Write an enzyme that holds these catalytic residues in place. Structure first.
Site, mmCIF file in Angstrom:
data_model
loop_
_atom_site.group_PDB
_atom_site.id
_atom_site.type_symbol
_atom_site.label_atom_id
_atom_site.label_comp_id
_atom_site.label_asym_id
_atom_site.label_seq_id
_atom_site.Cartn_x
_atom_site.Cartn_y
_atom_site.Cartn_z
ATOM 1 N N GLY A 26 39.885 45.483 27.835
ATOM 2 C CA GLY A 26 39.364 44.038 27.800
ATOM 3 C C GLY A 26 40.507 43.058 27.451
ATOM 4 C CB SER A 27 40.615 39.253 27.114
ATOM 5 O OG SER A 27 41.260 38.542 27.115
ATOM 6 N N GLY A 29 42.283 44.020 24.481
ATOM 7 C CA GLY A 29 42.961 45.169 24.352
ATOM 8 C C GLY A 29 42.150 46.299 24.734
ATOM 9 C CB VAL A 31 36.967 50.201 24.238
ATOM 10 C CG1 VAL A 31 35.678 50.872 23.966
ATOM 11 C CG2 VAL A 31 36.634 48.641 23.937
ATOM 12 C CD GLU A 97 25.470 51.875 17.518
ATOM 13 O OE1 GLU A 97 24.681 52.993 17.307
ATOM 14 O OE2 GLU A 97 25.243 50.643 17.250
ATOM 15 C CG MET A 98 30.922 57.471 21.516
ATOM 16 S SD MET A 98 31.429 56.545 23.112
ATOM 17 C CE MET A 98 30.973 57.988 24.279
ATOM 18 C CG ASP A 145 32.106 36.390 26.535
ATOM 19 O OD1 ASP A 145 32.055 35.408 27.457
ATOM 20 O OD2 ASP A 145 32.761 37.482 26.872
HETATM 21 C C1 LIG Z 1 30.446 53.490 25.668
HETATM 22 C C2 LIG Z 1 30.703 52.266 24.842
HETATM 23 N N1 LIG Z 1 31.662 51.320 25.232
HETATM 24 C C3 LIG Z 1 31.765 50.277 24.302
HETATM 25 N N2 LIG Z 1 32.546 49.189 24.895
HETATM 26 C C4 LIG Z 1 32.611 48.750 26.307
HETATM 27 C C5 LIG Z 1 33.748 47.944 26.537
HETATM 28 C C6 LIG Z 1 34.738 48.315 27.112
HETATM 29 F F1 LIG Z 1 34.800 49.595 27.651
HETATM 30 C C7 LIG Z 1 35.736 47.362 27.614
HETATM 31 C C8 LIG Z 1 35.577 46.239 27.373
HETATM 32 C C9 LIG Z 1 34.414 45.807 26.408
HETATM 33 C C10 LIG Z 1 33.439 46.470 26.197
HETATM 34 F F2 LIG Z 1 32.204 46.312 25.429
HETATM 35 C C11 LIG Z 1 31.441 50.332 22.976
HETATM 36 C C12 LIG Z 1 31.698 49.437 21.782
HETATM 37 C C13 LIG Z 1 32.346 48.167 21.648
HETATM 38 C C14 LIG Z 1 33.233 47.796 22.444
HETATM 39 C C15 LIG Z 1 33.842 46.494 22.368
HETATM 40 N N3 LIG Z 1 33.384 45.546 21.403
HETATM 41 C C16 LIG Z 1 32.373 46.041 20.749
HETATM 42 N N4 LIG Z 1 32.002 45.217 19.447
HETATM 43 C C17 LIG Z 1 31.748 47.311 20.690
HETATM 44 C C18 LIG Z 1 30.901 50.011 20.867
HETATM 45 N N5 LIG Z 1 30.346 51.112 21.381
HETATM 46 C C19 LIG Z 1 30.653 51.334 22.628
HETATM 47 N N6 LIG Z 1 30.461 52.224 23.363
#
Ligand SMILES: Cc1nc(NCc2c(F)cccc2F)c2c(-c3ccnc(N)c3)c[nH]c2n1
Ligand SMILES: [Cl-]
Length: 336
Positions: A26-27, A29, A31, A97-98, A145
């Protein structure tokens, strides 16, 4: 060197986190999906870039969903859960959490045909509950967003969803960042440079639910003039009482003799204002979006009329009159 951290896979952080895969950049960084050795569970870790902008935004995000954790309520469960946070290798790290893939991947799964009105209804209800929880006075959190990408399924074989990514998030009377909402989901108050409240998230939810069912973006602007001109195609010219109090109104429209507002030139051409009916986009009477739901169970004209009415309440030009979470949850579109 640069903003980002170290992607390896197989590496174990702090004799606790076994890193197996990167979910998506993401912008802000990265995950990554890792395994927690002490809690015996899977986790997604948000790795923020080594910059002030994104770190400051992460600190706000941390603060806002810590605040959400205090509340004793079932509704808090439609927001992603932050388990803990720690700084490591000079990076802020949020452990969540996943969950599963986003609602944009689920639409890409159908080849942008859209999901059923039955599933769109379940999503629309869970999001209206989530926006309701945000609107608690003590919270009064404006996500800023909301888009299919920031709505995630918990499990890929089920309907339960949650909101993520509160980096862009603020709290009612605040004007922190230059740019808020994704262009396709940007409410007209934000396009005209007017002050914004929790109403802008309900406008985003409206555009999202139509895209979930039609399979494509309601208003797909290339720029901000394109965005307003395409919202005008469906909903007509905005109210004169709105355009008369808007700093950036004379970007897109023009005041006329009668005290009226007409569009500016295409420069170089859209469908005339309000002539791109939301009736034919949903195809209430022509068998659903592009005729693809004809004959199909749970896709009656009655059902399409209730969905259509509710979306039009959410797509109100007036943020004062636009439908609020508590009252959108009473709509007949959800009636049991
Ligand atoms: C599979 C998966 N995925 C998740 N993220 C998916 C994802 C990306 F892979 C890339 C950019 C944004 C994004 F939400 C998340 C996040 C998540 C992630 C980012 N910010 C927040 N507040 C939560 C939490 N659990 C997740 N589980
Ligand atoms: Cl522009």
């Amino acid at each position: 060197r640069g903003s980002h951290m170290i992607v390896k896979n197989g590496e174990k952080w702090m004799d606790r986190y076994e890193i197996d895969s990167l979910i998506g950049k993401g912008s802000f960084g990265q995950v990554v999906k890792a395994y927690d050795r002490v809690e015996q569970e899977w986790v997604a870790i948000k790795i923020i870039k080594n910059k002030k902008a994104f770190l400051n935004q992460a600190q706000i995000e941390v603060r806002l969903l810590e605040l959400m954790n205090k509340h004793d309520t079932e509704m808090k469960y439609y927001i992603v859960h932050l388990k803990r946070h720690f700084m490591f290798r000079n990076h802020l790290c949020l452990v969540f959490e996943m969950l599963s893939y986003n609602l944009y991947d689920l639409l890409r799964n159908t080849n942008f045909r859209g999901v059923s009105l039955n599933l769109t209804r379940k999503f629309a209800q869970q999001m209206c509950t989530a926006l309701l929880f945000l609107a608690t006075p003590e919270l009064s959190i404006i996500h800023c967003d909301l888009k299919p990408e920031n709505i995630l399924l918990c499990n890929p074989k089920r309907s339960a969803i949650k909101i993520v990514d509160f980096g862009s998030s603020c709290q009612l009377g605040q004007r922190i960042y230059q740019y808020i909402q994704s262009r396709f989901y940007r409410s007209p108050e934000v396009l005209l440079g007017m002050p914004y409240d929790l109403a802008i998230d309900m406008w985003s939810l409206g555009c999202i639910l139509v895209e979930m069912h039609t399979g494509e973006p309601l208003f797909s602007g290339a720029n901000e003039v394109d965005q307003m001109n395409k919202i005008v195609e469906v909903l007509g010219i905005p109210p004169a009482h709105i355009l008369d109090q808007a700093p950036k109104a004379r970007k897109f429209f023009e005041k006329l003799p009668d005290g009226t507002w007409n569009l500016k030139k295409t420069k170089d051409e859209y469908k005339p204002p309000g002539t791109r009916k939301l009736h034919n986009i949903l195809g209430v009477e022509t068998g659903g979006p592009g005729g693809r739901r004809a004959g199909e169970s749970g896709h009656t004209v009655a059902d399409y009329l209730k969905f259509k009415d509710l979306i039009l309440r959410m797509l109100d030009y007036d943020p004062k009159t636009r439908i609020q979470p508590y009252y959108a949850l009473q709509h007949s579109f959800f009636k049991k």
